Enzyme design. Structure first.
Site, PDB file in Angstrom:
ATOM      1  CG  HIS A  40       2.736 -10.001 -23.973  1.00  0.00           C
ATOM      2  ND1 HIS A  40       2.412  -8.854 -24.864  1.00  0.00           N
ATOM      3  CD2 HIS A  40       2.579 -11.098 -24.651  1.00  0.00           C
ATOM      4  CE1 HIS A  40       1.933  -9.297 -26.057  1.00  0.00           C
ATOM      5  NE2 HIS A  40       1.803 -10.834 -25.934  1.00  0.00           N
ATOM      6  CG  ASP A  84       3.403  -5.653 -24.003  1.00  0.00           C
ATOM      7  OD1 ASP A  84       4.397  -6.371 -23.849  1.00  0.00           O
ATOM      8  OD2 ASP A  84       2.260  -6.200 -24.790  1.00  0.00           O
ATOM      9  N   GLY A 175      -0.314 -14.894 -31.121  1.00  0.00           N
ATOM     10  CA  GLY A 175       0.890 -15.298 -31.984  1.00  0.00           C
ATOM     11  C   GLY A 175       1.429 -14.107 -32.998  1.00  0.00           C
ATOM     12  CB  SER A 177       2.069 -11.165 -29.096  1.00  0.00           C
ATOM     13  OG  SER A 177       0.672 -11.080 -28.475  1.00  0.00           O
ATOM     14  N   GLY A 178       3.733  -8.566 -30.275  1.00  0.00           N
ATOM     15  CA  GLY A 178       5.197  -8.123 -30.684  1.00  0.00           C
ATOM     16  C   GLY A 178       5.389  -7.610 -32.108  1.00  0.00           C
TER      17      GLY A 178
END
Ligand SMILES: [Ca+2]
Length: 223
Positions: A40, A84, A175, A177-178
């Protein structure tokens, strides 16, 4: 990260910032040429920033390397956030040192109750917005699948796990994320989603990296 602490410069040497003119997501360095992040977080024009602490100040340990290729998981479904995960290949190899280092992929899935380290430059408030310049860290346990499924009825796949605190107050956030969830020195999770941040009975949901190790290895061996 909400309710966390300042990590300390370069104490999380596998943490990367993904930059498209500004920080937009985290990632994890897994070898000198490859970064794992969330699907995402996909966009074009990614520059990977390694050895970062303060993302607004050049402090002397940074390596800025443009992405040559981004590979979203073949089965990523943005509707459900199932699968994801993405891989980012760097245009040139990172120079590995004590402050820029790879994190090992898991051999087995992490145990429930294992305290994991989650890190990033995301929002630090559960209400309102405040984004840090330096890397923030959080220690949080993996929750049982039954509590995860109860928190998010009809939304948790076998490629997801929950971590955090049902009481609220401590969580990853927008922020982050990942970015990495590291348990017993292995990359077990990727910051994926949740309902707000640090809300009671709404823990963080994380991509279960152990389910992707064969795909990661195959992809790296062919790209
Ligand atoms: Ca910096």
């Amino acid at each position: 990260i909400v309710g966390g602490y300042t990590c300390g410069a370069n104490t999380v040497p596998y943490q990367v910032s993904l930059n498209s003119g500004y920080h937009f997501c985290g990632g994890s360095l897994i070898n000198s040429q490859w970064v794992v992040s969330a699907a995402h977080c996909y966009k074009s024009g990614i520059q990977v920033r390694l050895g970062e602490d303060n993302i607004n100040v050049v402090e002397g340990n940074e390596q800025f390397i443009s992405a040559s290729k981004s590979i979203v998981h073949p089965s990523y479904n943005s509707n459900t956030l199932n699968n994801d995960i993405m891989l980012i290949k760097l245009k040139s190899a990172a120079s590995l040192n004590s402050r820029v280092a790879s994190i090992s992929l898991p051999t087995s899935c992490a145990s429930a109750g294992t305290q994991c380290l989650i890190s990033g430059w995301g929002n630090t408030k559960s209400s309102g917005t405040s984004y840090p310049d330096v890397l923030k860290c959080l220690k949080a346990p993996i929750l049982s699948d039954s509590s995860c499924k109860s928190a998010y009825p009809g939304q948790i796949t076998s490629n997801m796990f929950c971590a955090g605190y049902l009481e609220g107050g401590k969580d990853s956030c927008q922020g982050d994320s990942g970015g990495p969830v590291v348990c017993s020195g292995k990359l077990q999770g990727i910051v994926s989603w949740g309902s707000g941040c640090a809300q009671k009975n709404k823990p963080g949901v994380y991509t279960k990296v152990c389910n992707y190790v064969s795909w990661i290895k195959q992809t790296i061996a062919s790209n």
